[PDB]
Design a protein around this ligand. Sequence first.
Ligand SMILES: NC(=O)c1ccc[n+]([C@@H]2O[C@H](COP(=O)([O-])OP(=O)(O)OC[C@H]3O[C@@H](n4cnc5c(N)ncnc54)[C@H](O)[C@@H]3O)[C@@H](O)[C@H]2O)c1
Ligand SMILES: NC(=O)c1ccc[n+]([C@@H]2O[C@H](COP(=O)([O-])OP(=O)(O)OC[C@H]3O[C@@H](n4cnc5c(N)ncnc54)[C@H](O)[C@@H]3O)[C@@H](O)[C@H]2O)c1
Ligand SMILES: OCc1ccc(F)cc1F
Ligand SMILES: OCc1ccc(F)cc1F
Ligand SMILES: [Zn+2]
Ligand SMILES: [Zn+2]
Ligand SMILES: [Zn+2]
Ligand SMILES: [Zn+2]
Lengths: 374, 374
Amino acid sequence: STAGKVIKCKAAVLWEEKKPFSIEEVEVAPPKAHEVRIKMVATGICRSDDQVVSGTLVTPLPVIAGHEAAGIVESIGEGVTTVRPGDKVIPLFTPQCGKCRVCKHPEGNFCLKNDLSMPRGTMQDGTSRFTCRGKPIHHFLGTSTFSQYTVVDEISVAKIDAASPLEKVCLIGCGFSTGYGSAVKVAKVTQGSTCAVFGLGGVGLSVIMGCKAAGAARIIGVDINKDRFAKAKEVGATECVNPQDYKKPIQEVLTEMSNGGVDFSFEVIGRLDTMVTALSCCQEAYGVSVIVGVPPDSQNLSMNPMLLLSGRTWKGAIFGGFKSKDSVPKLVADFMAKKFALDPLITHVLPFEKINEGFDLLRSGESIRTILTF
Amino acid sequence: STAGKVIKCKAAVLWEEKKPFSIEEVEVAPPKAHEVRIKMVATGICRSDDQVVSGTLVTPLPVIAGHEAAGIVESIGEGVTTVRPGDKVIPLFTPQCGKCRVCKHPEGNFCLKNDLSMPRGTMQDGTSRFTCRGKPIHHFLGTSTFSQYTVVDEISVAKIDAASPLEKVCLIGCGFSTGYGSAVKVAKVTQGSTCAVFGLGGVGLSVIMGCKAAGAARIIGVDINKDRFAKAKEVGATECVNPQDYKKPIQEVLTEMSNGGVDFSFEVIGRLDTMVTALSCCQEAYGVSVIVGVPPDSQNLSMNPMLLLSGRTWKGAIFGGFKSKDSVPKLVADFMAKKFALDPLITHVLPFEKINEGFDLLRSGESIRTILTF
Ligand SMILES: NC(=O)c1ccc[n+]([C@@H]2O[C@H](COP(=O)([O-])OP(=O)(O)OC[C@H]3O[C@@H](n4cnc5c(N)ncnc54)[C@H](O)[C@@H]3O)[C@@H](O)[C@H]2O)c1
Ligand SMILES: NC(=O)c1ccc[n+]([C@@H]2O[C@H](COP(=O)([O-])OP(=O)(O)OC[C@H]3O[C@@H](n4cnc5c(N)ncnc54)[C@H](O)[C@@H]3O)[C@@H](O)[C@H]2O)c1
Ligand SMILES: OCc1ccc(F)cc1F
Ligand SMILES: OCc1ccc(F)cc1F
Ligand SMILES: [Zn+2]
Ligand SMILES: [Zn+2]
Ligand SMILES: [Zn+2]
Ligand SMILES: [Zn+2]
């Protein structure tokens, strides 16, 4: 008895940059044509959400943030054919319209309907389904998961296994898939190679899982927080180094360790300097470096193009290069088949009402992934 | 008769930056172990040699430049097994030692014995085989082809078909292979794709040849000199554009023409601004951009890493990605079998004695490639 009606529910609203989320009542409009309204079951706290609070990732405010989640369909608008009420689903922060040139390309995944390149913070139709204190609130990446209910366009949701544990597979909505895919699909890590992963938070650990699954012989974790090394080795790092321990630049250390440069490097932090360092540490003639971290808004890096002329390949990707709607159900199935592990990424599980505390664990460095439960 | 003795011959010596070459007598020492002394037959004037004169490409002076050439073995040092006196050969400015990690890698070609990354201007043993006015003269990229005779390490020379027309196949020693391989081996241009090529000199025309060979549907030539357009279309460009004709930046023009960005772009000029423009004009999610041009010494470019994070691939390569000693003889065999044409690249021919006039033709923009005959 909620279908077709406005739902009044709790959501975490970000009214302004550099302020705590405000947990309060919002109104969620019913889904229009080709839209899906979801009751949220679990959502992760991803560094990108903090970057929105920090102002380094720009998107229109006020906003309902959150993009890594899973829930259950409450209702569908007219014309929806891929999910039904009661289905378990994961919102897709990168859509898959299936009709654009990128969707049709065998390698591309950054669908042209995304709200990332030039964020509008609305539904595909340019409007919002959220109201709070009488004011319209923006959506974020077409997902907006920090709410007991959200509405998403059909191209931004995927149906998953009805038996999946939503408090774990929400990670397939961002963190896990991004890291894993950056290794196995974007870099295409090869058996017996040497990999270096800069940044050992939730996404970096997933890159390590991918490098191990691809059969890398050496996976060097790189982080300035040594507290992260233990878990990195658990999931597959063979060695870990802290740049702060050395008197010489880390790229020099890594080139020496790998007898001339690594086969694959990954920047999984979001800093301009580590992107160049990661590039440099890969072997100059055949090395490949993948940018995964989201850089600060509007800032350019500076680099010497001879680093590329010698033969290096540099690339970046969103969401591990996975075509989202095709891939997410498959990843959940693979998870149910024990093909990979999600527990090592989860360090804290908190009620949704503790979202601010969850963000504090992330900022302090205490957590890898905190999952919020509704 | 000359075996084991010093040979006195004419060479084009560059005593100082920004000055004409001095054609005068030099002394060329006999080859030491694993060295090969070559009587030169033809050499091309490549933009890189002019960059040495300009000082934008740094290597120790005074020097005998020249690196795109063919000739006939005059004598071999002790232990040489891959060429013999009388064989036709092409010197390799990127060596192939066959032993280092890069030589052993299936994709790499920038052998660690190269004299390009940290140029010393000598033979592999750290010394010079050239004397002029009683002073030692530096080698260039282990080739030094602007001389009637040169001495090269065995790893920097390839034996070619004894019936090869040396005044045409010298281009396989640089210009043609670099461009053609940049398209077919490095970028891996696909059938039906859209390519954009920045710079329509000798190497850019070779990239067009490779794109056409690979089956590209559209090949867009980009150059500020419209006099280059006719020849570009002759070798396969479908359209040519001069950035100076437009009010908007050329990456916007190319993105418009290609309905969202090109599949493959190539920077074949050597400017920092065009490397970034070329990267930008490839499609944001799956585009590939290859840097072929040689940038000014020690200068960094500035770019926004979001260009990569969306999915673009950026890479560069030396000599078309070709393992040099393995590939050169195969490229010559293919030329002899009419698999590709070299004549369209050659616009002028002069005797070696007119090398300065040859450089004037390149600098004025009149020539594509001038071949010098000894
Ligand atoms: N490309 C995408 O689709 C995508 C998806 C998810 C996340 N991201 C980006 O990935 C990055 C990683 O996200 P996360 O959730 O793992 O973040 P996180 O904060 O959990 O991990 C960051 C890690 O980097 C380390 N670090 C910080 N500064 C460092 C330095 N100078 N040198 C070495 N290590 C350093 C930190 O100690 C921490 O362990 C963020 O920028 C995030 O926005 C991108
Ligand atoms: N990677 C390698 O192994 C390798 C090998 C050979 C040459 N190179 C480099 O390749 C580059 C091209 O060599 P080339 O012999 O073809 O040179 P070239 O001078 O014959 O051609 C350069 C072309 O660029 C055009 N151009 C100049 N400025 C431009 C601008 N702003 N926009 C568009 N077009 C512009 C010129 O008009 C000209 O046609 C040089 O930098 C050279 O050193 C690299
Ligand atoms: O973590 C989700 C995410 C991924 C890429 C990006 F550029 C912004 C963003 F929010
Ligand atoms: O044209 C030969 C050549 C190729 C690449 C480079 F970096 C320098 C150089 F001289
Ligand atoms: Zn699409
Ligand atoms: Zn995320
Ligand atoms: Zn080698
Ligand atoms: Zn050259």
